[PDB]
């Protein structure tokens, strides 16, 4: 969505951020989430400020994805796509983990 034309990695939908149904957008250099149908993302984090990740594995009925940033903030994305939730989480997690080193900037 950036004017710089970034490489959108993965567009996840039915992504609930604290009971807020929206979508999780993994963009080239930033992970941004927005509810239902919004142009302006609600939560935008850059792979450069993210320290590590945390994810609810297959032992979780609720498909969640926590992002631990260097700032001292951790956001847990609650995927509720009954058909892809887990895979979309795992996908995001995969892309997230793999793409992190590209912008990873230890500021803490």
């Amino acid at each position: 969505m950036a004017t710089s034309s970034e490489e959108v990695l993965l567009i996840v939908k039915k992504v609930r951020q604290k009971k807020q149904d929206g979508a999780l957008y993994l963009m080239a250099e930033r992970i941004a989430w927005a509810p239902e149908g919004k142009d302006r993302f609600t939560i935008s984090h850059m792979y450069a400020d993210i320290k590590c990740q945390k994810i609810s594995p297959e032992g979780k009925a609720k498909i969640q994805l926590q992002l631990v940033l260097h700032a001292g903030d951790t956001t847990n994305f609650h995927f509720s796509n009954e058909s892809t939730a887990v895979k979309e989480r795992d996908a995001v997690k995969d892309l997230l983990q793999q793409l992190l080193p590209k912008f990873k900037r230890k500021a803490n």
Partner: protein, 62 residues
């Protein structure tokens, strides 16, 4: 307004890049754990692995 989020089972994910070996996509922690992989990895792949490591290596110093 409530909270259905608990955080009782999360895998601390680690920023791990993908390094191909012999044309096969392996993870960095995967390639590093397998000496045979780096031993079967081409110069390009080895340099790629090394370079990919330098990226993370340049993000330390603390």
């Amino acid at each position: 307004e409530e909270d259905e989020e608990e955080d009782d089972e999360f895998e601390e994910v680690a920023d791990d890049p993908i390094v191909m070996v012999a044309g096969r996509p392996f993870s960095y922690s995967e390639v590093s754990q397998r000496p045979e992989l780096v031993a079967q990895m081409t110069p390009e792949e080895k340099e790629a692995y090394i370079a990919m490591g330098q990226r993370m290596f340049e993000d330390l110093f603390e």
